[PDB]
Amino acid sequence: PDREKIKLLTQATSEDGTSASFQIVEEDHTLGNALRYVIMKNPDVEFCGYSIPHPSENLLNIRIQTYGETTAVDALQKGLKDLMDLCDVVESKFTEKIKSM
């Protein structure tokens, strides 16, 4: 039950969601860029981008603004699910080509 990993920044959050900034510690461009790509691949997402506010801190601030269909949290959760699925496809294809060789 990790309660420190991902936080919701309330000052950056709208009413009823659909626009929220998340703070993700121990994260950098690696997860930020893949997550942003996958999240932009969602029709309801109108805005996605991350930022590492300072190199000294291992912190990532990812901003999601959606249209009214879904909330930023839902778009985030969908982005994480889709990133997992994509990496699973990559794993299967790569292990198959390794086995074939």
Binding site: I6, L8, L31, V38, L86, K93, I98
Partner: protein
């Protein structure tokens, strides 16, 4: 345009993906597996114990670069962390030698060791499951012989050079059975650690633990993991005569060839091409060629330091990306 990075004489164009809904009125390219699953493809070109070369085809730059970054900085490997000097009478300083020993890459497979917990006491931090203990005991003495005066030091002295292979695996606790079939040796045993003259000696032990390339370079498992986009050369109009041979000279040897009979220059192998855009400076081929790179065709080259195979390193990187996405997914979002 349209998936092709444009290689111009003074700039690079069309470098962003543009494969999302909201690029155009047709809100196409929504994410879905079973479209990415059927379009994505892997073509392995070569496999060694220390190098791999494969093509991730039809994948986005963010994911390919995520794998590359994970391999370089986040895949764990084992390297010496603490060096205890019983005796060091060589000219090489203790910390210099310790840093060099840290840079020696060990042929111990990770997942044989557990991560060290640094919250524990110093007396209780290193175990037979956390640490590899390597010793090094070298004493340099004059060779009891008489070759040509002032010859190479390999026969004027004994132990005149200290190699990485002189680092000895010392099983602790139950490692005597765990590591019996895979004794810990340097990945590169001819690494020159120190040179010493008669009367000089280096006695030490080194504790080797799991680490992360982001924490220190010595932990990185890849001597370089990177990719490159697939070069694409499009000969717009036929090139013939000596002009075709000059066009051929504009590229590395095998990249393009001259057809026999037609005497026209055709692209023979664009993979072998380095994009020096030499052809783009002659104003003779200005409109007869278009240089480009396929933006979603990545030619990965993963050369491993030696502790694990390059395909294993890449698979571990994909698994690391998936694991961090899943960890975030499971984590609750706190106000």
């Amino acid at each position: 345009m349209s998936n092709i990075v444009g290689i111009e004489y003074n700039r690079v164009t069309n470098t962003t993906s543009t494969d999302f809904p909201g690029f155009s009125k047709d809100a196409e390219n929504e994410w879905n597996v079973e479209k990415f699953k059927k379009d994505f493809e892997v073509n392995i070109s070569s496999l060694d114990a220390r190098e791999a070369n494969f093509d991730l085809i039809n994948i986005d730059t963010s994911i390919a670069n995520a794998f590359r970054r994970i391999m370089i900085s986040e895949v764990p490997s084992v390297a010496a962390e603490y060096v205890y000097f019983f005796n060091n009478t060589s000219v090489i300083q203790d910390e210099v030698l310790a840093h060099r020993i840290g840079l020696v890459p060990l042929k111990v497979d990770p997942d044989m060791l557990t991560w060290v917990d640094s919250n524990l006491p110093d007396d209780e931090k290193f175990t037979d499951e956390n640490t590899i203990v390597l010793s090094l005991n070298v004493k340099c003495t004059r060779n009891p012989d008489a070759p040509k005066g002032s010859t190479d030091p390999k026969e004027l002295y004994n132990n005149a050079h200290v190699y990485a292979r002189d680092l000895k695996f010392e099983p602790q606790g139950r490692q005597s059975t765990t590591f019996a079939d895979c004794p810990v040796v340097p990945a590169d045993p001819d690494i020159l650690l120190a040179k010493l003259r008669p009367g000089q000696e280096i006695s030490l032990k080194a504790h080797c633990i799991l680490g992360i390339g982001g924490d220190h370079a010595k932990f990185s498992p890849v001597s370089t993991a990177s990719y490159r986009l697939l070069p694409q050369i499009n000969i717009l109009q036929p090139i013939k005569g000596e002009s075709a041979r000059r066009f051929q000279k504009c590229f590395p040897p095998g990249v393009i060839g001259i057809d026999e009979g037609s005497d026209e220059a055709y692209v023979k192998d664009a993979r072998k091409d380095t994009v020096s855009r030499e052809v783009l400076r002659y104003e003779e081929f200005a409109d007869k060629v278009k240089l480009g790179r396929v933006r979603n065709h990545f030619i990965f080259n993963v050369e491993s330091a030696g502790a694990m195979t390059p395909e294993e390193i890449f698979f571990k990187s994909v698994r690391i990306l998936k694991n961090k996405a899943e960890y975030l997914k499971n984590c609750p979002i706190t106000q």
